[PDB]
Design an enzyme around this catalytic site. Structure first.
Site, PDB file in Angstrom:
ATOM      1  N   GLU A 165       0.811  -1.237   0.000  1.00 43.97           N
ATOM      2  CA  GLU A 165       0.000   0.000   0.000  1.00 43.97           C
ATOM      3  C   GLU A 165       0.840   1.281   0.000  1.00 43.97           C
ATOM      4  O   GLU A 165       0.786   2.100   0.938  1.00 43.97           O
ATOM      5  CB  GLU A 165      -0.980  -0.032   1.194  1.00 43.97           C
ATOM      6  CG  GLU A 165      -1.944  -1.184   1.122  1.00 43.97           C
ATOM      7  CD  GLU A 165      -2.975  -1.137   2.262  1.00 43.97           C
ATOM      8  OE1 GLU A 165      -2.953  -0.269   3.111  1.00 43.97           O
ATOM      9  OE2 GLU A 165      -3.899  -1.928   2.247  1.00 43.97           O
ATOM     10  N   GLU A 354      -4.910  -9.128   0.621  1.00 42.73           N
ATOM     11  CA  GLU A 354      -5.680  -8.881   1.955  1.00 42.73           C
ATOM     12  C   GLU A 354      -7.137  -8.740   1.573  1.00 42.73           C
ATOM     13  O   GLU A 354      -7.492  -7.958   0.672  1.00 42.73           O
ATOM     14  CB  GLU A 354      -5.326  -7.538   2.596  1.00 42.73           C
ATOM     15  CG  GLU A 354      -3.942  -7.490   3.172  1.00 42.73           C
ATOM     16  CD  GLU A 354      -3.581  -6.174   3.891  1.00 42.73           C
ATOM     17  OE1 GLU A 354      -4.415  -5.247   4.133  1.00 42.73           O
ATOM     18  OE2 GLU A 354      -2.364  -6.031   4.108  1.00 42.73           O
TER      19      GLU A 354
END
Length: 449
Positions: A165, A354
């Site tokens: 991220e 995720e």
């Protein structure tokens, strides 16, 4: 109907080093930007830290036994850079390597495929004292760290993620200041975005040059940004919102350009950033898979008098059910996102690195955690993933966030995503109903819906 995944589908679960390990100052580890951030009052909900967390640094054997009981076939984890180079560069801390070599070997002995994230937010504080990710040199220190890791683990670890991220590290860490290192400056956040992506490219090039016999990618934060209606002005608004969020990273990585709509906005705001011409060619090194972390979706309206030109469609958002994070639950969003990836980027191999949900957990009279809302979320989202697969998307793996309840960054311990409950006072683990449900999913390679 019976939802059955492909025969070779990879069922995994994920964690990150700061969120689980504890041992924040043990065995020669250097201070990280998250150590510093957590120690500073007002930054974390309830003044919680990752000093101890799940104490996985000491309790990894128990955790691996739990993984074996659930039957996860891959475990996604990250390496702490400051356990390896306490000062970011300079003297290698052999005890750091040693911990991760042991862990890796134990996973493999128990028939669990390791999947490693090189950077999950824990930049060595000494590097941040020198300017952190605003400093282009940090991209070389990252490549030098990546080299040591590839030398020690490369050909026993099949799956590698360079970064987790980068768009969150940039936006929350360097514009909003709500994540480490707590900076608030738009131009700095954009320089950080670029250097993160640059460091990804350098690592991938290195990985190829060292002929590591494994696969490598990057894990981006991605959501589908829905327009508020079918009007072209709403469609264009949503497209811009996405281009300033996940597509600001996807397009550099997979197409070797920043999105033009977002570049025009930043120019309109008086930021015209210029990086060497070759930086984008390096950023867009071929990767083996694109990975993403997804939980929810965005709904965006045209908003022409705003600084952005768009805003959240709150009237639409307020109608959905939400998690304990306040995030909307919209399973079809995962389908729409997977189909966008497949359509826009030449049918790439895809990994969901995720997905999961936070809900309030309660231990019953019976001693059990009967987390029905977490199971319903997971089942609804995995149903949509499967629908994507049936529609031709090359989705290869699903990593459930998280194996363990953990330190949720600025929320501290207040937000539980685990399929295994952790009491943070006693350190006891207890597998929730969601863990035993996932056990069943893996054994049946799916479920009924």
């Amino acid at each position: 109907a019976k939802i059955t995944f492909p025969k070779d589908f990879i069922w995994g679960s994920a964690t990150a080093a700061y969120q689980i390990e504890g041992a924040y100052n043990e065995d020669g580890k250097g201070e990280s930007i998250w150590d510093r951030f957590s120690h500073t009052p007002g930054n974390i909900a309830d003044g919680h830290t990752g000093d101890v967390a799940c104490d996985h640094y000491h309790r990894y054997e128990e955790d691996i036994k739990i993984m074996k009981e659930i039957g996860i076939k891959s475990y996604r984890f990250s390496i702490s850079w400051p356990r390896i180079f306490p000062e970011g560069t300079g003297k290698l801390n052999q005890k750091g390597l040693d911990f991760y070599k042991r862990l890796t070997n134990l996973l493999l002995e128990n028939g669990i495929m390791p999947a490693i994230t090189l950077y999950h937010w824990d930049l060595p504080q000494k590097l941040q004292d020198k300017g952190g990710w605003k400093n282009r040199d940090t991209t070389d220190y990252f490549t030098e760290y990546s080299e040591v890791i590839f030398k020690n683990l490369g050909d026993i670890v099949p799956i590698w993620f360079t970064h987790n991220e980068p768009g969150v590290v940039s936006l929350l860490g360097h514009f909003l200041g709500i994540h480490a290192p707590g900076i608030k400056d738009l131009r700095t956040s954009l320089e950080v975005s670029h250097n993160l992506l640059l460091s990804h490219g350098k690592a991938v090039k290195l990985f190829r040059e060292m002929n590591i016999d494994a696969q490598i990618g990057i894990a981006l934060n991605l959501s589908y940004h829905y327009p508020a209606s079918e009007k072209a002005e709403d469609i264009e608004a949503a497209e811009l919102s996405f281009s300033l969020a996940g597509r600001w990273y996807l397009d550099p990585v997979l197409k070797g350009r920043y999105p033009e709509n977002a570049l025009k906005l930043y120019k309109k705001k008086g930021i015209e950033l210029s990086f060497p011409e070759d930086d984008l060619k390096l950023i867009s090194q071929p990767i083996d898979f694109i990975a993403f972390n997804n939980y929810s979706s965005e709904f965006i309206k045209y908003d022409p008098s705003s600084e952005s030109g768009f805003s959240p469609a709150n009237s639409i958002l307020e109608k959905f059910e939400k998690t304990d994070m306040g995030w909307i639950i919209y399973p079809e969003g995962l389908y729409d996102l997977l189909m966008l990836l497949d359509r826009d980027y030449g049918k790439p191999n895809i990994v969901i690195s995720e997905n999961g949900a936070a809900f309030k957990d309660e231990i019953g009279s019976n001693g059990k955690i009967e987390d029905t809302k977490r199971i319903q979320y997971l089942k609804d989202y995995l149903t949509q993933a499967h629908r994507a697969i049936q529609d031709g998307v090359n989705l290869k793996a699903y990593y459930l966030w998280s194996l363990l309840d953990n330190f949720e960054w600025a929320y501290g311990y207040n937000k539980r995503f685990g399929i295994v409950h952790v009491n943070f006072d006693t350190l006891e683990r207890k597998i929730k109903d969601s863990g035993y449900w996932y056990k069943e999913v893996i054994k049946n390679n799916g479920f009924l819906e």
